[PDB]
Amino acid sequence: MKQGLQLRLAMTPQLQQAIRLLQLSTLELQQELQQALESNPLLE
Amino acid sequence: MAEYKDNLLGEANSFLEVLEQVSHLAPLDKPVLIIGERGTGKELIASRLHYLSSRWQGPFISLNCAALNENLLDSELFGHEAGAFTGAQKRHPGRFERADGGTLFLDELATAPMMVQEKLLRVIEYGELERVGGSQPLQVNVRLVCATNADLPAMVNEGTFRADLLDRLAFDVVQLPPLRERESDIMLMAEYFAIQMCREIKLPLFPGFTERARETLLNYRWPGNIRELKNVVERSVYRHGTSDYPLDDIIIDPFKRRP
Amino acid sequence: DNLLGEANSFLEVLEQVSHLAPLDKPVLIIGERGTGKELIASRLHYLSSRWQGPFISLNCAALNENLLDSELFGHEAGAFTGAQKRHPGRFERADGGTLFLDELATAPMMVQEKLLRVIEYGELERVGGSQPLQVNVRLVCATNADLPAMVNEGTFRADLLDRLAFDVVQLPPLRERESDIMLMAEYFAIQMCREIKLPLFPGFTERARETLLNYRWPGNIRELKNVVERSVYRHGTSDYPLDDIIIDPFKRR
Amino acid sequence: KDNLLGEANSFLEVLEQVSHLAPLDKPVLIIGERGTGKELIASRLHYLSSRWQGPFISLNCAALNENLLDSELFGHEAGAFTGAQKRHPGRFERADGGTLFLDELATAPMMVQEKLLRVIEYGELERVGGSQPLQVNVRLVCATNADLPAMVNEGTFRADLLDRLAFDVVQLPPLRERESDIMLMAEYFAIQMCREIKLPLFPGFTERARETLLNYRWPGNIRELKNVVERSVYRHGTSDYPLDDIIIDPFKRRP
Amino acid sequence: KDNLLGEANSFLEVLEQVSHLAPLDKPVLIIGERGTGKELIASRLHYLSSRWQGPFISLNCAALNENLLDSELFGHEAGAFTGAQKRHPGRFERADGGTLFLDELATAPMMVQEKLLRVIEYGELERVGGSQPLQVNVRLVCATNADLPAMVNEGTFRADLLDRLAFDVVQLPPLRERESDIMLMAEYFAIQMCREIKLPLFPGFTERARETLLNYRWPGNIRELKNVVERSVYRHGTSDYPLDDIIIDPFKRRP
Amino acid sequence: MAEYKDNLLGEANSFLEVLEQVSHLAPLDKPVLIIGERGTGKELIASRLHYLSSRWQGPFISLNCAALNENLLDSELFGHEAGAFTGAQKRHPGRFERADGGTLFLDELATAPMMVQEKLLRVIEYGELERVGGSQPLQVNVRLVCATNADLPAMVNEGTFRADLLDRLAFDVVQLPPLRERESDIMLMAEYFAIQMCREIKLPLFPGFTERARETLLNYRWPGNIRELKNVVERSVYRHGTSDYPLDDIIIDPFKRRP
Amino acid sequence: KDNLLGEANSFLEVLEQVSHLAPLDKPVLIIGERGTGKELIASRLHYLSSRWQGPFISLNCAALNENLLDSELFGHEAGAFTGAQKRHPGRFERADGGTLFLDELATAPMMVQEKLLRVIEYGELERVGGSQPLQVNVRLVCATNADLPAMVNEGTFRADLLDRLAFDVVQLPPLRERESDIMLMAEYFAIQMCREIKLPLFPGFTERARETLLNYRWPGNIRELKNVVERSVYRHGTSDYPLDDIIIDPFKRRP
16 A cells, blocks of 8 residues: 555464474484384374 | 345336346346446345345445545455565455455446556456465456446546446446336335334334325435435434324425424 | 523424434434534433433544444454454444434545444444444434535435434524523533632623624534633623623734 | 457457467567457467466556555565565566566556666566565566557656567557458357356347447447347347347437 | 743733633633744743643644554553554643643644544543543643634634634734834843853944834744844854844845 | 676767767766666666776666655665664665665656655765664765766756756766767667577578668667667567568568558 | 865855854854755864764755654654664764754755754654653754745745744855855866876866856856866866866767
C-alpha cells in the first residue's frame, strides 16, 4: 500500500533436544544414535 | 436442486418473465450482468441468483467497490503471497482468491478505479489470479455475477467505465423494471410488508390500507423498488394507526420534519 | 429524567422515541447543531424495557487502525500474544439494551455496508470475536449533522438507511421557540449555581433577553448555554440586570 | 495454443510472426484492439517461447499501487519499514526468466513510465537498502490499446518507455478489419459454450443475422461477438431459432 | 509570575479576562497574534488558577503525522497494541489536572477536529486497550492567530465541535493597535539587549528612532517587537550615541 | 590501467573528440557532467566513462530518482542507523552509503521532489553523511558522474530545476550530439548493429543495407541517438529477409502498423 | 576558516559582522547568494563563535522525509510502533549546544514550517509518547537564496517561520555585485585549478578574459565563477594561454 508495513510462534523441550543433537559431531552423533537405539524397541 | 427464495419480492408485470429468463440462463455460469435500482431489487436480484445458482456449497462472495479503499484493494483482488503485504504471515487469501468456484457477486458502485476495472478484466480473462509477489500464477475458477445501477454504455462512451472491461464481460445484460414502471405488485408488496411489520412489532392486527393511502402511494414515485417502498411501509407502521383509522393519514414519507 | 422543553413537534418526536425504544425496531433521529438530542435518547432508554440493560452510545468517528470489521470484533491476530482483553464489540457491549449511534453523518463507506448487513443478517466474523450480531437491542441513531440532501449527496446510502430507519425524528432549531431555550437556560443556570457555584445571576433586561432570543441561536441549546455562561462571566456579579446581550464571544475593544 | 483464432491470412501471418519471435527473449509490443484478446496470443507465444519451461508471470501495469509500486516491482528486504520478514522476490524476480506480459501498459503513469524506463535495463535488482542489486534476465512482453507514439507525443509515456520496446509492435486488426474466418471462429466458440452450458446445439442456426453482423462495428473485436452470441442464445432460449431478429444489441430496449 | 510586556488599560482588561478564564475550568480560546507568547500568558493564567502547581501541555496542533490519540495524546500505557505491545504515557492522560494549551489549534486536521469534538464533548477520550475512558481533569486552552469564525464558515472545522470547544473566546488588542507599550516594550528590549550582548547601556531611541517606532505599522506586533529587538541589536553600534534610526529592514539592501 | 569500453557507440564526426576530451578529464574525480539524448548516447557514455574512470575497485553505484518511492527515498539516501526508521536491525547502508569512494552515477530523472534536490545539495557540500536517527554525522567520499537530457537553465528559469542544484552541480558540460546532427558513423554503427544481429540470431550472412535503407535512415529523424537506431535495426532484422533482397522492404520502423 | 574569502569591502564587512554575532547564539539568517558557499563560511564562523570547540551538525532543511518528520526532528522513544531499541537523539539533539545551521530552508514544507515553529520554542524535546520534553539550548543559523519575505507574501513562509530568525538578515553579495576581489579571487582560483590539474602555472596568465568575464552576471556568485575558471583552464590544454579566447559558456555549442 504505502511506504508503511507491519510485523507478524513458540515451542520447546523435545524439539530443543532434537536440534541440540544436530549441533554435535559426526562420530559423536553416531555414538549418540547407537546409545539411543539401545533402548528403542521400535527402531532398526 | 431448487433453493427457495427468501422473499416473494416480485412484480407481476414483468418480474415473473425476468425470473423465467434468469432461470433459463441460471444453469449457465457465463458472464452474467444484471441491472436495476441500486439497493432496491438489485440486492434481491443477487439473492435470487444465489438461490437459483447451479449445484450447492458455492461460497456466495459479495463485495462493494466503494469499500476496501484504494491501495489495499489490489492485495485483496489479486491475492497476497509475498512478505510485507498483509502483515506477511501466511499467504493472505485475496477476495478473488478466497472465492474458488463460488459466485462473485459484483456491485454497481461504479468505482472510479478504472485501474481496478482493468485489473478485474484480468481477474476474469482466462480464469486465474496471481497473488502479490506470487512466484507462479494460479488458475482460479469462480462463478461471475454482475448487477447494474446506471447506464453502462453511457459510462463507456464518457469513459467512466473501461470499454475493454465491458467488452470482455457481460455475456448478457438484464435490466430490472423500475418501480415507476412495474406498478403491479404495489398493493401485494404493501400488504406483505404490512404483515411482516405487524409480525415483527407484534401488532395485534394489520391496521389496513386506505384508498386515500393507496392513492398517495400510487402518487409516490417510489425511487427505491425494494427499499424506498419498504422505507415508506416502515414509516407508516412506526407512525401506526388507530383501530378505527386503518390508514388515515398514514405516514408513507418519513423524511418530512415535524411541525 | 432529563430537563426538556418538548413542544408539539417534540411531542411526536417523543412518541416515536417511545415506539422505537420499547419496540426494538431500529430508530433514526435527527437533531440540531447544539440540540443535544442525546438526552432524549437517554430518556427513551429509561422508558424502554431495557432500562437496566447495557447503555453504550458510540460516536462513530474515532475509528482507529484498520477498524471496520475489527471495530465490531477486535481480532488483532497479526502479532503479539493473541489473547485480547478488550474485544467487546459494538453489538455485544450494548446487547440487551439500546444501541445509540452518534456522529454517523461523517461515517466511512466501508462501515456503512457492514452495519446495514450486521443488523438484518448479522453474522459478524473476526479472529478476536465472532457472533451473529443482530442483538435485537433497539437500534438508535442520532447526531444527524448531515442533512438528507447531504445523504443523497453520497455522504450516506439511501436504501440501507431507508430499510434500517422505520421512523425519523425531526428537531426544529432553538430559533423556532426560544422559550424552552429560556427554560433550558434557566436549568443550565441552576446547574451552574450548583457545580460552578454561581451565587446569583446579574439578571436580564427585556431588551437584552429579547435580543438574545432575537439571535438566530445557530448552536441551539448549546449556543444558549454558552451565551448564558459568557453573560455571567462578563457580568461577573449579581448587582444589576444584564441590559445588554452578548451576540458572540468574538469581539474587540 | 488454444485461442479460437480465425487462422485467416492476417491471423496466419500474426501467428507466424509470434512463432518466429517466440524464441526471442527481447521485449515485444502488442498493438491493435484490446478487449479482443491479443493477450491470448501473447500467452501462446510465451508457451512457444524459448523459455517455454520457465515461470512466466504477466502483470497489469494499472494494478500496482502508487505508494506500493516499489513493493510491486521488487521485494521488501525487511531491513527497513514496519514490515518484517518480507525478503520476498518481486513479481519479476518471482518469474526471473519467464514471460511478464505487461497488462494495462498504456495505463502506466509518468512515474510508472519512469519505473519501466529504469526496468528497460537488465536485472540490477536492489531491495530496500540492498547491499548490491541483483541481475536476473527475463523475457518481456507488453500490450497497450492506446498508441504508444500517441502517448509519447502527448508525453504521457516516457521516451525510454517507447525505447524500451525492441521487437515489432504487433497490431491487432479489428473485427471488421479481418472478418474472414470470424464466422467460423464464432460458430466454434458458440458450439463450445453450448457444450459447456449443457446446450446441445441450435437447430435454427442460420447466418443471415451473422452475415448482417459481418457488416457491424463490433468494438470489442473478439469478445463482443461472443458475448452477443451468448446473449442471443440465452434470450432466444431455443435451439430451433434461425439467425433471424438476432442482432448485437443487448443494451438495446425492445419496442 | 512571569515577566510580561503590555500594561495598557485594554491590556489590563485582557489580563482580567485571562484571570476570569483561570477561575473557569472549562475550555476556552485566546484570540491574538501568534508570535506574541499567547501560550505563555495562558500558562501564567493557569498558574494563577486553582492548579497553581499543575502540569502544562504545549499540545501543538500540527505536531503529529500518522499518529493516533492513543499513540501520543491518550498514549499507549496499556498493552495489546498492534504489532509491538508496550507501555506509552499519554500527554492528555499525563497532563490531566494540569494545563493543556492548544498551540495553533486552527491548524488541525479534519480527522483531528473530529476526534477533538468527541474529546471535548464526552470528556472520556479513552485509549487503545484502555478499559476506563475516565476523565481528563486538565483545562483545555488555545492560543492561535487564525480566525476559526472564518475557518468554521469555510468548513475547515466542525461548527458544533468549535461551539463545544469555545465558550468565552476573547481577543487581545494588537500592540500595533495599542501603540502605547511601544515605548515601554522598547525600553525593556533595550535593557534586555544591553544585558545579553553585554553592551555599555541602551543607546537610546533618538527622535527619528522614536518616531520610526511610533509610526511603524508593527505588522508582527510582538513578533514585530522581537524584530525591533533584533534590528536594534544589529544596529547597536555604540551605546554612547542614541540609535538615530532604530527602524530598519533586513531585506533592504544598504546603499 | 586502460579498460576498453564494452561498446563504442559514438559518432565519427565529433564523438571521437568527445571521448578524447573525456579521457583528458578522466583522471579528475570532480563532478563530471555528461549530456545528450536520454536513453540513447547517455548511459553508453556512462559506461565509457566508467571504463575511463580513475583507479579501480570503485563502486559505480547507479541510482535513478524515479525509484525509492517517495517516503522511503530519504532513508535509502542518507542511510539509517537508529531504530524505527529502518526497522532497527543493522545500521542500514544507504544508497549514498553503499558507494564510498565510488562514482555517484546520476540519471537525468529530474526528481520532481525539490526535497530530494535539497537533500542532494547537502549530499555534495563538504563530503559528509549522517544516518537516519544517527547520533553522529559521518564524512564520506565518493566520485560523481551524471548524464543529462534537458536544458537545466531552461528548467531553472522555469523553476523546474533548483538554482542551487545547478549551482552546486554543472562544473563542466559534456553534451552528446543529437542523432539528426552527427550523421557520420551512421553507416558504421548500422553495419556494426547488422553484424551483431547476424551473429546473435545465427543468420548465415548479413543481408546487407540497401541504398534505399541507408537513404531512409539518413532521412529518419531518429530522436534517440544510440538506442532508436538500435531499436530500428532490431525491428528491421526481426522483419527478416531472404538472401535475394539485401534490404528491400525492410521494416526498420516497427511502430508502423500493418495493412 | 579555510575559505579564500574575497575580503572585499562587502566580504570584509560580512566577516566582521559574522565575528560580532559569532559570540551571540541567537537565530540569524545568512542571506545573499547560495551555491556560493554559505556552508563553508558557516563552518568558519562556527569555529569563530563563542562555543568554537563544540559539536556542530548542519543539514539540508528538505533532506528528510515527510512520514519521518518526527523521527528526524526527534528520536524514536520506541515505546510504540515496530521500531525497537532506538532512543537515539536527533541530529539537533546530537549537537546539544552546537549550531543548527539552516540550509535549503526555501524548500521546507508546511509541516516543516510547523516543526520549525515548534523549534522556535526554548528546547522542549518531546519524543513520541515521551515522559516530558527536554529543553536543550543550541546555536542557530540560517542561510537561503530566496526572500523569506517573498514567501510570506506568497504565504509559503509562516509568520513564525519569518520570525524564526532572531537577527537582521545578512546578505551575501553576488559576483556581478561585489566584483571587488574578482581579480584576487580569480587568481586564487586559477592557482588552485592549476594545482589540481597538475599544472604548475599558466604561462599565458593575464586577466583580459577575466576582465571581460567581470562584466558578466555570474549568477552562481562564487560557484559559477569557480566552475567557469576551472573549465577554461581545462579547455586551454596548454599553460602558455593568456586571458584571451577564454569565457564562461559551458552550455553553448562551440563554433
